[PDB]
Amino acid sequence: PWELTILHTNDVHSRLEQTSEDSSKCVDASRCMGGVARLFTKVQQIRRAEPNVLLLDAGDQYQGTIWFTVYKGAEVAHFMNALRYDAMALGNHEFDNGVEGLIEPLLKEAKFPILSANISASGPLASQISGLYLPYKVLPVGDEVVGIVGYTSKETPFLSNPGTNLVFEDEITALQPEVDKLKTLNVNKIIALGHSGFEMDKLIAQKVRGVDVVVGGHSNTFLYTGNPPSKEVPAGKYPFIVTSDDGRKVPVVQAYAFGKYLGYLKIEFDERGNVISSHGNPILLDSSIPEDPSIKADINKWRIKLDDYSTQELGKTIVYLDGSSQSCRFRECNMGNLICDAMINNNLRHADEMFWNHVSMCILNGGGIRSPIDERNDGTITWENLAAVLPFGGTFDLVQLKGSTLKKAFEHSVHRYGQSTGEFLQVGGIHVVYDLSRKPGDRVVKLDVLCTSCRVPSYDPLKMDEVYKVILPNFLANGGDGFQMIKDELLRHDSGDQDINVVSTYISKMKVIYPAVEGRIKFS
Amino acid sequence: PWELTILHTNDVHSRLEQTSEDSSKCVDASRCMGGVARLFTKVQQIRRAEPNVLLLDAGDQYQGTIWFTVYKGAEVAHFMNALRYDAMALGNHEFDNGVEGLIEPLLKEAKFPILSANISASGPLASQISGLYLPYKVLPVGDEVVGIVGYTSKETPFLSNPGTNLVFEDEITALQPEVDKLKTLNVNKIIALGHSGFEMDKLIAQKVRGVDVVVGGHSNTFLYTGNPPSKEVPAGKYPFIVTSDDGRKVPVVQAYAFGKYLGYLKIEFDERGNVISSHGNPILLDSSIPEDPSIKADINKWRIKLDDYSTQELGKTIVYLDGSSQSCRFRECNMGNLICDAMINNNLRHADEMFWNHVSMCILNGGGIRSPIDERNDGTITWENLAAVLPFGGTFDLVQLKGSTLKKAFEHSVHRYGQSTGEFLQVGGIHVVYDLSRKPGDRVVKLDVLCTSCRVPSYDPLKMDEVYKVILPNFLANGGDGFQMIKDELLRHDSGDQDINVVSTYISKMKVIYPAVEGRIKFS
Numbered sequence A, B: 001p002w003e004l005t006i007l008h009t010n011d012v013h014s015r016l017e018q019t020s021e022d023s024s025k026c027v028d029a030s031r032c033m034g035g036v037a038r039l040f041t042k043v044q045q046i047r048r049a050e051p052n053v054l055l056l057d058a059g060d061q062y063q064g065t066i067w068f069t070v071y072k073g074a075e076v077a078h079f080m081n082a083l084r085y086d087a088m089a090l091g092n093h094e095f096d097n098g099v100e101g102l103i104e105p106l107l108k109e110a111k112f113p114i115l116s117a118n119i120s121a122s123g124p125l126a127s128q129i130s131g132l133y134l135p136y137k138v139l140p141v142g143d144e145v146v147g148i149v150g151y152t153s154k155e156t157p158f159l160s161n162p163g164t165n166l167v168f169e170d171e172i173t174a175l176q177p178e179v180d181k182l183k184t185l186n187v188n189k190i191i192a193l194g195h196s197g198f199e200m201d202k203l204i205a206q207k208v209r210g211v212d213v214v215v216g217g218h219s220n221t222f223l224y225t226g227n228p229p230s231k232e233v234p235a236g237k238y239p240f241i242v243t244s245d246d247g248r249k250v251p252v253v254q255a256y257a258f259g260k261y262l263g264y265l266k267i268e269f270d271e272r273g274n275v276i277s278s279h280g281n282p283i284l285l286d287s288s289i290p291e292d293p294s295i296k297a298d299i300n301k302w303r304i305k306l307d308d309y310s311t312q313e314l315g316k317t318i319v320y321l322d323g324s325s326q327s328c329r330f331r332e333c334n335m336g337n338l339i340c341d342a343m344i345n346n347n348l349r350h351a352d353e354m355f356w357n358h359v360s361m362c363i364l365n366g367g368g369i370r371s372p373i374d375e376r377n378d379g380t381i382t383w384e385n386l387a388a389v390l391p392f393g394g395t396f397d398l399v400q401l402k403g404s405t406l407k408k409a410f411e412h413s414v415h416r417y418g419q420s421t422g423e424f425l426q427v428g429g430i431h432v433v434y435d436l437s438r439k440p441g442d443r444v445v446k447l448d449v450l451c452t453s454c455r456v457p458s459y460d461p462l463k464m465d466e467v468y469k470v471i472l473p474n475f476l477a478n479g480g481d482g483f484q485m486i487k488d489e490l491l492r493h494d495s496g497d498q499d500i501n502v503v504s505t506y507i508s509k510m511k512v513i514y515p516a517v518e519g520r521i522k523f524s
């Protein structure tokens, strides 16, 4: 048999440095995990031991920490080049800074092929970008070749800023003819590498004839065979085996997110490129694996510009930004309003004639707001100030919730009101009125929401059967602070931009801010 | 006697072109008035006839039309230079584009002295600006000299954008020692030329010893001796005679605004510089005086860049901007909200630790909103589109109103509701609730206003005895659409920036707008 070792990462999300166990800032260095220096150590060890290795990224290196804010993708090109990645698929967050912010820092500087078979361009953009990403690449591996075929979420226009000169085609439609074409070119070992989520990954494995292995991302899917090595709970075995429409067994892999694990799959192929066997497991990059000293020293060099940036003025406030718990856990607070207005602003995407914007609504638990910002420092706001408000290294995510689920969340918001608990909700695009003299679970007496499918935004009563888009912290999407109804009842969940970066972008755009408390939340 | 002819303008406010009778756009050319070409004709005729002439401007050439938007003061330097003005005093609107927007276009390019004795600078600004404006200038006139001493409203920090490195001193305090100094220098004929308003002009005439004549502005004061030649109603005789604390009769003049009239005062002096007699009258610059063809042709040349600018994209909207009368005369409309939010934004000035901003409140009659803007032209908004919404050539002014006066205005807003009448009020920083089943004059059931003297802006009930600052159209400050209570009861009124320019600046700053209808006005 001819044996190939596939090493793979996905949704690294700017975790260039080692992190805590939960992927937020490293505090206790001796129990920290991930980061590119440690990844370098483990990839170099595997390349010493195994003759045929590919190192692949399934997209979403962009967006997640101050690294991306400051270096805008140049850190991705530089450090992925240092690790000698073999190929990368485009993820949705690679379009966060528009097509221009992808061509220049990443497409022009990467030393490896960047792939997506289902993205087409038209007009002058088509000539500008031609060949800078590719539908696939054939790579020599020892005395063999392997075809790698890319794909990117069709939902990217709702999740990022690709512009209106790119079209995201159905993945399976776009992929099949490229895989058929590779077969005519005597390429019998084919990896589909892409960024659409585990459910779509399984469909590609099932339906795209001639794919031998699917290496995915986007859904942050953790798969494991055996007892798991950390806190992540497996969604299935690694690899997850799909029985294809042509009768083959096709392994599907993913490796969680944030650079915490290195995916590792060993495939044995026969001479005609059929998969004889597949086995492996993601490797937890914990503190037992040393950081490579050379990469670590380059990281510490690049950190200087970050530390400088962190104390620069982003913008000014002329009002006190009240993120005190005595306000934000008991009533509408103007820090909560600022943060939700920034969330909505970050999620302005290109629209149909059927909506002014696809999302208008925001919720934010008051327990997530961790500091005020005083306006008396000449009004200045810095990244460092925002990091005190939003210290958990979260994201502001897009979900779909039925009205009944949202009413349940608002009842939960006040179920034990008066104890300074974290679940009290700050809001945007929602006007709620509570009557606290009513029994827990029956205290919401009015709940109106801003329309999306309307040319003039205005408020209407919340409808129990209608499904609403809502921007909220990943902590809430995951059921934190007791919002189990959100985790259990949501219809869709996509991970969004870094919390601090959403607020910092909005402050920088506005220049001078003055958020008021204006009646979004009232008590009767 | 030695006879001096003083020609004077004030508060021209960017009326470089001839205007209608009411100072808005010229429609019927053969009955149009003012403009610099016609002014040139009349000044040149007077200079042929009278040997000793000074042509003076008492400030506020800046701000008022698209001329100022595009040329930013370069049009003022150029055309005031072409008319060979002798001196100008700084007005409040000369600081609309900051100190930098006054030094460069105006101070560096004017060929005549620009004066203010009561403005001091500190820090590096003091060295940058030293001698670019002067407390006074001594001018030769025939074989004599005349001293001209400038002054500028002490309220300029609340009316414009002078920055925090300029200090506006009390006028009389600053003026007296400069006038005493001119007397030691054998200058016995002294004109105080300045921009503080007719009431302060009379105080200077009364109290500043040795001033022979006061030439003022800011209050748009029309003075006339005899039957008046147009629609303006005189506030007093021209000149208005003040009996000074040292026993002299001191003439005080002003000449309305907008370039409609040329002030003309003839003074006879004895050999020691005492005023023997004063008489004259503003001259209405009507169509019987021809436009100078050379100046007119230069005006038409400079107009090209205006016409080009008028169709340029200022910014984008992703929502329909509903300025229809069926919305804005019956309920909260999102064009009204946009326009009021722009008004408040235009009136952000440097604040004390005693307020977040000195003004938070806005009213706008729905009859003043004259078009919607469709968002389906790729979202683009142009100046030309804004001119359709706001076609009257007005300003957004600052007034002080007791709460009782404002409650009366809100009752007037709905006194005959249902007829599509113009007085229905759009708002900012105010939340009103009407009950239309109540009798006219008793339909306002809740009226809450955004605080100013607070670090976190929030809403409280309106207090009948408290005096509120409010930004509103000059049409309303003047009692239009039946708001006689505003005209009759207001405590303070200062004229503000051009209506279209306030909105265009705000759109350009925001880049992408999406105003909602959000509950500022409700019916119960």
Ligand SMILES: O=C(O)CN(CC(=O)O)CC(=O)NCCNC(=O)[C@H]1O[C@@H](n2ccc(=O)[nH]c2=O)[C@H](O)[C@@H]1O
Pocket (backbone or CB within 6 Å): A365, A366, A367, A368, A369, A392, A394, A421, A422, A423, A475, A480, A481
């Ligand atoms: O926040 C508290 O009530 C607990 N405290 C109070 C304090 O710090 O003064 C101490 C503490 O240990 N807090 C750190 C962990 N966070 C929380 O306990 C609360 O903070 C919020 N939280 C925590 C983690 C997170 O990722 N997101 C988030 O919103 C939740 O509302 C949660 O209830």
Ligand SMILES: O=C(O)CN(CC(=O)O)CC(=O)NCCNC(=O)[C@H]1O[C@@H](n2ccc(=O)[nH]c2=O)[C@H](O)[C@@H]1O
Pocket (backbone or CB within 6 Å): B365, B366, B367, B368, B369, B392, B394, B421, B422, B423, B475, B480, B481
């Ligand atoms: O506006 C109307 O109801 C009268 N119309 C209706 C229409 O044009 O379809 C005709 C008209 O002659 N209008 C021009 C003059 N303006 C007005 O009559 C109304 O427009 C508003 N107006 C007028 C002049 C002004 O300077 N500011 C201002 O707000 C007032 O609400 C006033 O009631």
Ligand SMILES: [Ca+2]
Pocket (backbone or CB within 6 Å): A188, A189, A190, A210, A211, A212, A272, A273, A274, A275
């Ligand atoms: Ca094969």
Ligand SMILES: [Ca+2]
Pocket (backbone or CB within 6 Å): B188, B189, B190, B210, B211, B212, B272, B273, B274, B275
């Ligand atoms: Ca004298």
Ligand SMILES: [Cl-]
Pocket (backbone or CB within 6 Å): A196, A197, A198, A199, A200, A219
């Ligand atoms: Cl999925």
Ligand SMILES: [Cl-]
Pocket (backbone or CB within 6 Å): B196, B197, B198, B199, B200, B219
């Ligand atoms: Cl006055």
Ligand SMILES: [Zn+2]
Pocket (backbone or CB within 6 Å): A011, A013, A060, A091, A093, A218, A495
């Ligand atoms: Zn991701």
Ligand SMILES: [Zn+2]
Pocket (backbone or CB within 6 Å): A060, A091, A092, A093, A195, A217, A218, A219
């Ligand atoms: Zn993704």
Ligand SMILES: [Zn+2]
Pocket (backbone or CB within 6 Å): B011, B013, B060, B091, B093, B218, B495
């Ligand atoms: Zn003026």
Ligand SMILES: [Zn+2]
Pocket (backbone or CB within 6 Å): B060, B091, B092, B093, B195, B217, B218, B219
């Ligand atoms: Zn003025």
